[PDB]
UniProtKB/Swiss-Prot annotation, chains A, B:
Pathway: Sulfur metabolism; hydrogen sulfide biosynthesis; sulfite from sulfate: step 1/3. This is Sulfate adenylyltransferase. ATP binds at Q194, T195, R196, N197, G288, R289, D290, H291, V330. It comes from Saccharomyces cerevisiae (strain ATCC 204508 / S288c). NCBIfam families: sopT. The gene is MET3. Catalyzes the first intracellular reaction of sulfate assimilation, forming adenosine-5'-phosphosulfate (APS) from inorganic sulfate and ATP. Plays an important role in sulfate activation as a component of the biosynthesis pathway of sulfur-containing amino acids.
Length: 510, 510, 255
């Protein structure tokens, strides 16, 4: 269907003949520069390539306010997620309306020139409540307060070039490009599938049934910008998509990556996804259970109800101009060797099997088997590689502050001991000297599968620098992972405690 | 047989009742301390545990000189390798005869008290020529000049404790201990096998035949102190020995580790090995082809003739007091599915197969198959782990000084590109800032299998800090591993050059 | 169909006889092979019959045998073509051919080695391996020679305890025959059963015939001993080693 607002605002194409001129202005000595944050790069790419039609810049306060309370742009155009350029006070003060500023990437690549319409300090409590529902634990609110700038700069954009990406150049289709790809194949009915996760047999099955019921071709449009915190990296995920797309019948599916920065804003985001896919050329879209929802908070309560998304999108059905296909999740029937829509089988009368994310995570952590009815083997092989089991995981042993035995000798004892065991893990007694440049290397070593022995703890005002994954404290204190019987426990006893701890946790296997 | 000189100089046992007294003296405030170098720890352990009977300390000049020219101690006792305590001038000056000094390990563990008999500056050109044959490339001469102190301190030793080791506590038998292990099994004929390498089927076969011909039990006595430069680490090797010892018929073999510091001094060392094994309780010993020889020098010439060792040991036969079993190397006969002594088959009349070290190294580098007739599978599995093939090897790409493209962008491009590929290798753009504390981490990352992208070169006065294995220079210069067409070559072209280079070299496999 | 014939291995005469016999059983044709029904060569390595005596003799009686004799066209395997072809059709020096002699087949079976499907069908090879197991599965006997002055009761006990350490499932027995025929005749049955027997003393020479000599080894100082002792009073532990390593060299034990 036609782009939201009727026109594809592909600013790259619009400004093609001003590229040199704009590029030269961006590189002028007198122009004020702003370095785009990683989320802003995600947003500006979608504005510049028309992914966010009718947007043609970051929202000024007039539009922003309507989006916050009315879920629309001041002109009444449905638009549920505010896209603004958040800056700090120091920069906001240097700019006034009509000021033209340059937006760079990595402090070296000019992306666009923004003509300032306004500068304002939004009430983040209202946005937090109105747009994201108010739970301080909602990733969007966390970002809203802890990362986002306190001042929004609204203004019209002029394009120099889209944010630079060196990976998957072939798959990052812009709206215009994707539309031409469909057009060259004569596809005029396309159902799009959103995801920020690996795809298993069930996803393959459900998307194909969608294709069959909507009489449409399939578009697997995964998000590769910012997704939920803790999600699997997009490189791993792209590898999985590239693998699963080969499992569809020839000529029925197309894989294209979307550099979107999700807010995990549930029902509002679901609407936004529909609009965005319409701009990219899809005729149909599937909205899932708790679509774009971040789940439950600490108190175990739902950030959104499982059907809020589908209900909200349905309420805007008459103006979305993109058909929404009903979400029919499928489950595996052992006794019939097939998948079937969950709404068609009687739980208490028919056998069904499925592997929850929690269980999948466990199996991967212990190197256990994962059945082909759940996920294709080539897909599982990829997941095991990016997330190796414990015998292949790195780790660190931190000699606590309470230790009175010789740190130099205990570290040497641990090294010599670990080195006896096989498995190929690399070991290092690592001294950081409380230097940040060294502390930041700890998780890289662990990520590399290495075993580090750290002679002493770093200062508390440095915790933030070190990731806590697979990092274990050896100390007399109660908060120690490997508790010492006493501060002067004999080195050989300590060594045993560590070895058996690592064994119990799967790092060593004999 | 009886220890060389007639008495096992086990100083640990001799001084058992002075341990507290000696320990207290070593920890006195006024006593002069010397930190033992890694080779001296190897030597003192063998002196203290009687491994070097009749030695009871480091050689004074009187004995040392006789060993250098006469191959004997001043009393006429056969002794071919000088064992001295080499120190720098600053320390030598602080000591005079009768001075009692303490010998520590790791600057914290007291090993012994040495009563200085003399202090002298040896003519290292004579020792180099007389003891090690004079080739400046002989590892012993290299050490003699580049590492060893210029002053020898001769003196009698009193034991506090043997050098601390936390790995393989069970297998490091002292002479007295090994002798009791043989005695408890009623073994009175034992043939010992020396090695600083992995053991393959041929070694298993030849040692068993030795046992059969000498009517003796087998002692696999591998060196785990210092061996030849470039040798496989002893942890890997011990794993292999522990594995192969299980392939002998029950009750025929015993595995014990020897903390010797080899000099790779060919025929002289061969004699020394015989003496040492006699002290440890062996009745027989096998002297191999080019036994304890370092091979050929740069000009491709032999450091020693292949039979110098066997000939020298044979010339001392009447006073060694340990039988030397003839070395009968075996080779595999495909057509008969068996190994047979090489001196029994006609090369041109019978089929024989064998895998040279060079070829073994290749197969391991490319992950190729290695047949069970060559080495037991459990042994090969261990070698593959410590020395993984290229797809599992780490590496570094150094952005040369000639580069005029943006280093920050080229590094980012390489990262994003590498991250597309699968395989689980971990990647890092690593900035060392010419800091030693960071440069020394490069090979640890590579040893961990990681891929590092280094934005700029380090200063030449730092080369020594970084190992050169799997480190590749991207530069316009001729000495670059990955040569740029020009200093400003487009980033995408450079990326391709690197990817294809790494592929050609096996790091990436598609 | 099985024929309860008692062959005489009488070469060409027997070949004729086989033709007659098959005619009686109803065959219209018969193949006479190379050295058909021949026993091979004698000690001096000379042929009991010429390779074509049989075919020639049968051919000379062709007009009265009343059964057609089909020419014998032996086939060989062509690796490069994955097929068998008549040996009389290929040029030895121009075309690759593979084949496994009886001697080699026997070896492979004795050592448990692989035998390729181009030579014999796997189900056929499985059967041959069962009736003729490789050395690790073969029985054997160790006879303590008459020259031994060490204690026979202790050496036998030492050997037993030692063998019992090793795995593999072979059953062991210190077997006393007391020169009784009823016991001596059981030796090869035990060996045929895969068992390992330790025999404390030799039987009288007028009894040799009763015991098969397969896998029976003499431990003695004499020159004709399979496992030669350094001396009659060699220490028991040394003797044990000599035996273990001998059995290993010969494939009975594998570690
Ligand atoms: Ca703030
Ligand atoms: Ca719920
Ligand atoms: Ca205490
Ligand atoms: Ca010097
Ligand atoms: Ca040579
Ligand atoms: Ca240029
Ligand atoms: Ca013949
Ligand atoms: Ca005697
Ligand atoms: Mg882009
Ligand atoms: Mg020690
Ligand atoms: Na429409
Ligand atoms: Na999904
Ligand atoms: Na709700
Ligand atoms: Na002696
Ligand atoms: Na060797
Ligand atoms: Na020579
Ligand atoms: Na003839």
């Amino acid at each position: 269907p036609a782009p939201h607002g009727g026109i594809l605002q592909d600013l790259i194409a619009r400004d093609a003949l001003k590229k040199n001129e704009l590029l030269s202005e961006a590189q002028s000595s007198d122009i004020l520069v702003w370095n785009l944050t990683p989320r802003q790069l995600c947003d500006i790419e979608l504005i510049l390539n028309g992914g966010f039609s009718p947007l043609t810049g970051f929202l000024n306060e007039n539009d922003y306010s309507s989006v916050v309370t009315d879920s629309r742009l001041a002109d009444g155009t449905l638009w549920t997620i505010p896209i603004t350029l958040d800056v700090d006070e120091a920069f906001a003060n240097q700019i006034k309306p009509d000021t033209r500023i340059a937006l760079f990437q990595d402090d070296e690549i000019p992306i666009a020139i923004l003509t300032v319409q306004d500068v304002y300090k939004p009430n983040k409590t209202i946005e937090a409540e109105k747009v994201f529902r108010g739970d301080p634990e909602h990733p969007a609110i966390s970002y809203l307060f802890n990362v986002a700038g306190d001042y929004y700069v609204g203004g019209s954009l002029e394009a120099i070039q889209l944010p630079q990406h060196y990976d998957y150049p072939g798959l990052r289709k812009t709206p215009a490009q994707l539309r031409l790809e469909f057009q060259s194949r004569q596809w005029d009915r396309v159902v799009a599938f959103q995801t920020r996760n690996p795809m298993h047999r069930a996803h393959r099955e459900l998307t194909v049934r969608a294709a069959r019921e909507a009489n449409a071709k399939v578009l697997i449009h995964p998000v590769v910008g910012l997704t939920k915190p803790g999600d699997i990296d997009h490189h791993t995920r792209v590898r999985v998509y590239q693998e699963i797309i080969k499992r569809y019948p020839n000529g029925i599916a197309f894989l294209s990556l979307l550099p979107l920065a999700m807010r995990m804003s549930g029902d509002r985001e679901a609407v936004w996804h529909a609009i965005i896919r319409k701009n990219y050329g899809a005729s149909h879209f599937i909205v899932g259970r708790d679509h774009a929802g971040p789940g439950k908070n600490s108190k175990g309560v739902d950030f959104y109800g499982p059907y809020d998304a589908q209900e909200l999108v349905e309420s805007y059905k008459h103006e979305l101009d993109i058909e929404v296909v009903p979400f029919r999740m499928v489950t595996y029937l052992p006794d019939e060797d097939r998948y079937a829509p969950i709404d068609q089988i009687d739980t208490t009368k028919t056998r069904t099997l499925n592997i929850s994310g929690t269980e999948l995570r466990r199996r991967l952590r212990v190197g256990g088997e994962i059945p082909e009815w759940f996920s294709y083997p080539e897909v599982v092989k990829i997941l095991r590689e990016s997330n190796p089991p414990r015998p292949k995981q790195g780790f660190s042993i931190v000699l606590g502050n309470s230790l009175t035995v010789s740190r130099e000798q205990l570290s040497i004892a641990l090294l010599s001991t670990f080195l006896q065991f096989g498995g190929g893990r690399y070991y290092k007694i690592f001294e950081h000297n409380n230097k940040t440049e060294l502390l930041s290397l700890i998780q890289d070593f662990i990520g590399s599968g290495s075993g580090l022995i750290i002679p002493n703890q770093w200062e508390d005002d440095k915790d933030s620098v070190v990731g806590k994954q697979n990092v274990y404290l050896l100390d007399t204190s109660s908060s120690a992972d490997i508790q010492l019987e006493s501060a002067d426990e004999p080195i050989s006893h300590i060594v045993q405690k560590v070895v058996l701890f690592l064994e119990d946790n799967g790092f060593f296997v004999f």
